[PDB]
Amino acid sequence: SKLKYFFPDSQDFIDPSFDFVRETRNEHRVRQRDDHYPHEVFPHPYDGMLVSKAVVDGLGGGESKYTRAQRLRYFRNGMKHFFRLPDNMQTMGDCGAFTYVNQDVPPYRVEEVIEFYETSRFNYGVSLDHIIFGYEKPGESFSGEVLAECRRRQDITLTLAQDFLVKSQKSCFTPFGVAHGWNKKSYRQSVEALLAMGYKNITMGGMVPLKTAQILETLEEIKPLLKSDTQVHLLGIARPESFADFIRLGVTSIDSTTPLQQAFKDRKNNYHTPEGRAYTAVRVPQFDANPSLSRKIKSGVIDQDVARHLEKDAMHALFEYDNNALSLEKTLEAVLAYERLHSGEKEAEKIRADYERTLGDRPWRKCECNICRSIGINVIIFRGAERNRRRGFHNIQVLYNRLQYTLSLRSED
Ligand SMILES: [Zn+2]
31: which residues sit within 8 A by CB, 6+ positions away? 67, 70
- Is 94 known to be catalytic? yes
Return the closest-CA partner of residue 47 out of 96, 13, 81, 86.
Answer: 86
Yes or no: say if 111 and 25 are a contact pair by the CB < 8 Å rule.
no
Distance 124 CA to ligand 1 centre (A): 30
Distance 54 CA to ligand 1 centre (A): 32
Q: Give 3-state DSSP helix, strand, coil % of the chain, rounded to 5.
A: 50, 10, 40
3-state secondary structure 326-366: CCHHHHHHHHHHHHHHHHCHHHHHHHHHHHHHHHHHCHHHH
3-class state of residue 18 by DSSP: coil
- Is 255 known to be catalytic? yes
Distance CA 30, CA 285 (A): 26
Distance CA 176, CA 204 (A): 10
Distance 276 CA to ligand 1 centre (A): 13
Distance CA 236, CA 257 (A): 7
Yes or no: say if 6 and 253 are a contact pair by the CB < 8 Å rule.
yes
Distance 367 CA to ligand 1 centre (A): 5
Distance CA 4, CA 6 (A): 7
356: which residues sit within 8 A by CB, 6+ positions away? 328, 332
171: which residues sit within 8 A by CB, 6+ positions away? 114, 117, 118, 125
Yes or no: say if 330 and 357 are a contact pair by the CB < 8 Å rule.
no
DSSP, residue by residue, 131-170: -------TT----HHHHHHHHHHHHHHHHHHHHHHHHTTT
Identify the active-site residue in 47, 94, 129, 322: 94
Angle between helices 144-167 and 110-120 (to 10 degrees): 50
Distance 270 CA to ligand 1 centre (A): 12
Distance CA 259, CA 339 (A): 25
109: which residues sit within 8 A by CB, 6+ positions away? none
- Largest separation between any pair of C-alpha atoms in the chain: 72
DSSP, residue by residue, 296-325: HHHTTSS-HHHHHHHHHHHHHHHHHHHTT-
Query: What are the residues facing 4 on neighbouring strands?
Result: 253
- Final resolution, Å: 2.5
Distance CA 81, CA 170 (A): 25
Residue type, 250: G
Yes or no: say if 69 and 101 are a contact pair by the CB < 8 Å rule.
no
Q: Does an H or E element contain 222, and which?
A: helix 212-222
Return the closest-CA partner of residue 32 out of 10, 49, 48.
Answer: 10
Yes or no: say if 32 and 9 are a contact pair by the CB < 8 Å rule.
no
3-class state of residue 201 by DSSP: strand
The helix/strand count (H/E) of the chain reads as 16, 10
286: which residues sit within 8 A by CB, 6+ positions away? 311, 383, 384
Yes or no: say if 279 and 358 are a contact pair by the CB < 8 Å rule.
yes
Q: Does an H or E element contain 218, and which?
A: helix 212-222
**Torsional class of 92: left (φ above 0), alpha (ψ -120 to 50), beta (otherwise):** beta
Residues with beta carbon < 5 A to ion ligand 1?
367, 369, 372, 394
Phi, psi of 31 (to 5 degrees): -60, 135
Distance CA 205, CA 227 (A): 20
DSSP, residue by residue, 239-299: -GGGHHHHHHTT--EEE--HHHHHHHH-SS--B--SSS--BPPEE---TTT-HHHHHHHHT
In the 8-state DSSP scheme, what is residue 1?
-
Residue type, 260: L
Yes or no: say if 186 and 150 are a contact pair by the CB < 8 Å rule.
yes
Yes or no: say if 48 and 8 are a contact pair by the CB < 8 Å rule.
no
The upper half-sphere exposure of residue 139, i.e. CA atoms within 13 Å in the direction of its Cβ, equals 0
Return the closest-CA partner of residue 404 out of 109, 45, 149.
Answer: 45
Distance CA 18, CA 10 (A): 21
Yes or no: say if 127 and 159 are a contact pair by the CB < 8 Å rule.
no
Distance CA 347, CA 156 (A): 50
Query: What are the residues facing 233 on neighbouring strands?
Result: 203, 253
Identify the active-site residue in 255, 266, 305, 354: 255
For 22, 111, 255, the CA distances from 167, given in Å and listed in that order, are 55, 7, 26
For 282, 318, 353, the CA distances from 329, given in Å and listed in that order, are 15, 12, 12
